[PDB]
Design a protein around this motif. Structure first.
Motif, PDB file in Angstrom:
ATOM      1  N   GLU B  14      22.650 -37.540 -13.594  1.00  0.00           N
ATOM      2  CA  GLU B  14      23.577 -37.347 -14.708  1.00  0.00           C
ATOM      3  C   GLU B  14      23.559 -38.541 -15.642  1.00  0.00           C
ATOM      4  O   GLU B  14      23.487 -38.394 -16.874  1.00  0.00           O
ATOM      5  N   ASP B  17      20.307 -38.617 -17.682  1.00  0.00           N
ATOM      6  CA  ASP B  17      20.352 -37.629 -18.765  1.00  0.00           C
ATOM      7  C   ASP B  17      21.167 -38.118 -19.955  1.00  0.00           C
ATOM      8  O   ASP B  17      20.690 -38.122 -21.103  1.00  0.00           O
TER       9      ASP B  17
ATOM     10  N   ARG F 106      27.875 -30.651 -22.657  1.00  0.00           N
ATOM     11  CA  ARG F 106      27.398 -31.559 -21.619  1.00  0.00           C
ATOM     12  C   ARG F 106      28.446 -32.623 -21.319  1.00  0.00           C
ATOM     13  O   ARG F 106      28.801 -32.859 -20.158  1.00  0.00           O
ATOM     14  N   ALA F 109      31.453 -31.046 -19.697  1.00  0.00           N
ATOM     15  CA  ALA F 109      31.222 -30.783 -18.281  1.00  0.00           C
ATOM     16  C   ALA F 109      31.261 -32.056 -17.449  1.00  0.00           C
ATOM     17  O   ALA F 109      31.841 -32.068 -16.358  1.00  0.00           O
ATOM     18  N   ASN F 110      30.640 -33.133 -17.928  1.00  0.00           N
ATOM     19  CA  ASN F 110      30.695 -34.389 -17.188  1.00  0.00           C
ATOM     20  C   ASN F 110      32.138 -34.837 -16.993  1.00  0.00           C
ATOM     21  O   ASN F 110      32.570 -35.139 -15.871  1.00  0.00           O
ATOM     22  N   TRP F 139      29.218 -24.671 -17.461  1.00  0.00           N
ATOM     23  CA  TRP F 139      28.622 -25.322 -18.624  1.00  0.00           C
ATOM     24  C   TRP F 139      27.281 -25.961 -18.281  1.00  0.00           C
ATOM     25  O   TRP F 139      26.335 -25.888 -19.073  1.00  0.00           O
ATOM     26  N   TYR F 140      27.175 -26.596 -17.111  1.00  0.00           N
ATOM     27  CA  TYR F 140      25.890 -27.162 -16.712  1.00  0.00           C
ATOM     28  C   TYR F 140      24.833 -26.075 -16.608  1.00  0.00           C
ATOM     29  O   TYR F 140      23.689 -26.266 -17.035  1.00  0.00           O
ATOM     30  N   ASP F 143      23.539 -25.259 -19.806  1.00  0.00           N
ATOM     31  CA  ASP F 143      22.580 -26.270 -20.221  1.00  0.00           C
ATOM     32  C   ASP F 143      21.338 -26.273 -19.341  1.00  0.00           C
ATOM     33  O   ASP F 143      20.454 -27.113 -19.535  1.00  0.00           O
ATOM     34  N   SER F 145      21.058 -27.237 -16.357  1.00  0.00           N
ATOM     35  CA  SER F 145      21.008 -28.346 -15.416  1.00  0.00           C
ATOM     36  C   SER F 145      21.378 -27.736 -14.075  1.00  0.00           C
ATOM     37  O   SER F 145      22.546 -27.656 -13.693  1.00  0.00           O
ATOM     38  N   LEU F 148      23.115 -30.230 -11.368  1.00  0.00           N
ATOM     39  CA  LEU F 148      24.503 -30.561 -11.666  1.00  0.00           C
ATOM     40  C   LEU F 148      25.419 -29.356 -11.487  1.00  0.00           C
ATOM     41  O   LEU F 148      26.518 -29.477 -10.928  1.00  0.00           O
ATOM     42  N   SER F 149      24.989 -28.182 -11.957  1.00  0.00           N
ATOM     43  CA  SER F 149      25.772 -26.972 -11.727  1.00  0.00           C
ATOM     44  C   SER F 149      25.897 -26.700 -10.239  1.00  0.00           C
ATOM     45  O   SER F 149      26.943 -26.249  -9.766  1.00  0.00           O
ATOM     46  N   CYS F 152      28.555 -29.060  -8.858  1.00  0.00           N
ATOM     47  CA  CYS F 152      29.883 -28.593  -9.239  1.00  0.00           C
ATOM     48  C   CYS F 152      30.277 -27.370  -8.426  1.00  0.00           C
ATOM     49  O   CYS F 152      31.426 -27.245  -7.990  1.00  0.00           O
TER      50      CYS F 152
END
Lengths: 129, 45, 260, 60, 271, 284
Positions: B14, B17, F106, F109-110, F139-140, F143, F145, F148-149, F152
């Motif tokens: 993360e 990125d 992005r 979401a972070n 949201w990931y 994108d 990702s 990351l998804s 989550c």
């Protein structure tokens, strides 16, 4: 004796499975580290370009202002040794990238730190023109 | 240990990125800004 | 190339603020300070960065002043630790503060041996980073080496909670609690680590800590020495642990003095 | 002897991986700081672009 | 919220360049293009808020074209990247490819977006030749190992065994190695060049101690011996043994299938 | 150094919008808000966070939404830093709203993942944490990702299963399995996923669904077929089928002896054993 041998077989089976566990995780770690090292290479290039552009900006702003069980135990140990060799190499290998990227990240932090300020410098100067 | 290492590198993805995107955006904005200072100097002369 | 001395003289001449009647006709002094800072930067080297940073501060460009970092860099490269510390202090104040505070603590610990200031800097950097684990490791190490065993153990507890390295953390914490003569606290820490972290329960560090706790409970200094040698034979000890266990053995000797 | 050698290699690899975990903790730390500073950089770059544009319009 | 259609209409009205007599009294057209691009961006953000990703991508594309006409190439590239993002999220692979192409041209970032474009071509459009070209170019600009891995994989799957082996040699020199050697040899064996495969095996054994004792080296040696003796069944047995301990991937499956079919072709030449 | 209180007072004085007749002669109020925000930034851990919040509000009033979001992120940083979880949550919410409104999903979401972490650990608001994790994963995914998804969704499924929502947790585990299939990088995650999913289906008393999941994992993933997790799941399914709680406990102890169990699994199996006890109550 038979029960103990059976227990040894089960133990070596689990050890092999876990050794394989370590290996996949390590290979993913190396893959991701290669990709992230590369993203950081991209970062490094932009920092270099921004340094050049800040030099240009410095001079422009300045001018602007101027203007069977035994055999299986043996075979399982064989395989555990095989995977273990690869696990050791992986641990050594992951360490080297962490060292290299750590120095690269230190330099990225410092270069980003500087540019940030150079931009603030020229922005404050432009505000007065 | 291998599993934990894998998880931590997944987490750090993360950061990488976001860093890449921010530095890239910054570079383009700096380039535009330099273009503006160039035109400003052209006029001020 | 221009003479740096002449450039510095010109910067000093331009760096004089407008006074009296001239102030009614002279514009803002910020431009004069900016020109003096540029001249100082050209001439520069750590002293010249410092002068340029002061002029930039007088001009209101605080970020530009934060020249202080370059001064720290060149002073450190030049071996002048005191001026590097000063430059880092001004840069930290202007700003990054945690990064440069960690660097300042490193300079204090290694170059100037000002361990109290290094501890303060590491604590401050760790707090801001949390705002950290590396800074807290440094702070706890220095505090334990400084006689502050309870505070070091507290920082080790914070590190354990944040990281839930751990295998060592528990050990170190227990060692600190044993340096404070609090064997009960060391036993509590060992039990907590065993029950909370399965890796630590079976780790050699857990066995070593239990052996040390037992040795202190029985007051057998020789047994503690034997356990230390056994631990060294498989996992080399570090100077921090050496100091902690030396103070512990001297505490056993002090108890033997209290025995009389 | 083969099993003892295997055990020794595994213990060594555990040590190396413990070292790696400490290093990756340091890498995460380097990265949380760099992400935040790259954010600072992006903000400053946008601010510089806007300021330069405003001066361009002023000189025009 | 403003109507995106009305915003697009206003942008189109403002996007008309000054012509004829009016050009002598109208200032630079750059400002009109900038205003049209801003209107398009607003309408497109509204579309994105409505999950109409394809319309939002089209509106980013119009804004990027107007920005290009205005001379703001960097803003045009960013808008093209946004177009690629929303088209890809909207399932429109062709428009995403186009947007990535314009962004890459403007930037030449080019390598990153070229790698993304190659991924899109390989997975979404199955344009393997263009994916190979994109990966090769991205690796060259990065120079790269990952892009070259992708390029070599696709090239070997595409019948270009010699080029894939050359890229694997480049990867070996730059550096993964344990596999690289194997893969390279496999490619050289897909090209019927058993001598080259043996040379690669010897080079890997002598240069990399890890590869010498690695299962990949033994498997490659077994494959080389099997091809030398022309025993397809022995090759199959070796493949099964290798799979039993280290699972094979579709790339290796294809390479060894072509190799076995080449043994069958040799059996045809035997007659 | 300037007094932060005096700077804040000056910012408040400058932050008053022009009203009445003066509005006809005073220019755009954006510059006043910008100056007040700059003063607030200078003056501005809890007090610093409050002052960032004031600066962000002034920036919003000035139209500089991106700067407002950045200042909100700094406010969140310091509120979390001061132990003030509530103000940090608020700051993250404003920053997330600003970023999402600007298309930076992005960033949204972070910061939503960070907000969910804060809710789960600091405030124990598990429902809001689940919502944040689900949204961040979505949201990931938008994108692309995947990892990351996937993280989550792991968090969301864990909290949902701990929250009594076994069916939804199993659905999220199925999504994770589908997303991670074919990737050499996430296989163990898969090995666990299947297990967890089955456990959730067994917490819902749906032994048939757990068996279907076990069969699907065995047939689809060769690694999972021979994994201890598959054997453990089969043993649990058999134990629930025979209604032998003691056998389930024995299997749990055997599994722990080789692979340590986690609190999530502890809770799931505890609810399962209590469900066996409830069946024993229905037995009367």
């Amino acid at each position: 004796i038979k029960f103990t041998k059976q227990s040894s077989v089960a133990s070596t089976r689990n050890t092999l499975k876990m050794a394989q566990d370590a290996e996949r995780a390590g290979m993913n770690t190396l893959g991701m580290l290669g990709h992230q090292s590369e993203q950081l290479n991209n970062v490094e290039g932009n920092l270099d370009l921004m340094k050049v552009q800040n030099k240009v900006a410095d001079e422009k702003v300045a001018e602007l202002k101027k203007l069977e069980m035994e055999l299986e135990i043996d075979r399982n140990l064989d395989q555990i040794q095989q995977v273990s060799n690869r696990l050791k190499k992986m641990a050594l290998t992951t360490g080297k990238e962490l060292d290299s990227q750590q120095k690269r990240l230190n330099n990225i932090e410092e270069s980003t730190d500087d540019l940030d300020i150079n931009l603030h410098m020229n922005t404050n100067r432009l505000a007065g023109i | 240990l291998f599993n934990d290492m894998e998880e931590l590198v997944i987490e750090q993805q993360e950061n990488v990125d976001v860093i890449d995107k921010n530095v890239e955006d910054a570079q383009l904005d700096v380039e535009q800004g330099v273009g503006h200072t160039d035109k400003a100097v052209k006029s001020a002369r | 190339m221009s003479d740096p001395v002449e450039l510095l003289k010109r910067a000093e001449k331009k760096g004089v603020p407008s006074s009296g009647f001239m102030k009614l006709f002279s514009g803002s002094d910020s431009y004069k300070f900016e020109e003096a800072a540029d001249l100082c930067v050209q001439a520069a080297a750590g002293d010249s960065f410092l002068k340029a940073a002061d002029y930039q501060k007088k001009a209101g460009n605080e970020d530009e002043a934060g020249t202080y970092v370059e001064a720290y860099k060149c002073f450190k490269s030049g071996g002048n630790s005191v001026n590097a510390v000063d430059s880092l202090e001004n840069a930290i104040q202007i700003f990054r503060g945690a990064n440069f505070k960690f660097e300042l603590g490193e300079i204090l610990e290694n170059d100037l041996h000002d361990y109290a200031k290094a501890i303060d800097c590491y604590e401050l950097a760790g707090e801001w980073y949390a705002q950290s684990n590396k800074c807290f490791i440094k702070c706890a190490d220095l505090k334990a080496l400084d006689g502050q065993y309870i505070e070091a153990s507290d920082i080790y507890s914070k590190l354990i909670k944040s990281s839930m390295s751990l295998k060592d953390y528990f050990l170190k914490k227990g060692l600190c609690q044993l340096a404070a003569t609090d064997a009960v606290a060391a036993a509590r820490t060992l039990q907590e680590g065993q029950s909370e972290d399965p890796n630590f329960a079976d780790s050699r560090e857990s066995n070593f800590l239990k052996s040390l706790i037992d040795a202190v409970n029985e007051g057998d200094s020789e047994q503690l020495s034997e356990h230390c040698k056994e631990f060294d034979n498989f996992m080399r000890l570090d100077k921090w642990k050496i100091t902690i266990l030396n103070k512990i053995k001297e505490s056993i000797q002090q108890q033997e003095d209290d025995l009389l | 002897s083969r099993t003892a050698e295997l055990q020794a290699e595994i213990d060594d690899t555990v040590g190396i991986m413990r070292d790696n975990i400490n290093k990756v903790a340091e890498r995460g730390e380097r990265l949380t700081s760099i992400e935040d500073k790259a954010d600072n950089l992006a903000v400053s770059a946008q601010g510089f672009k806007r300021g330069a544009n405003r001066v361009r319009k002023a000189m025009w």
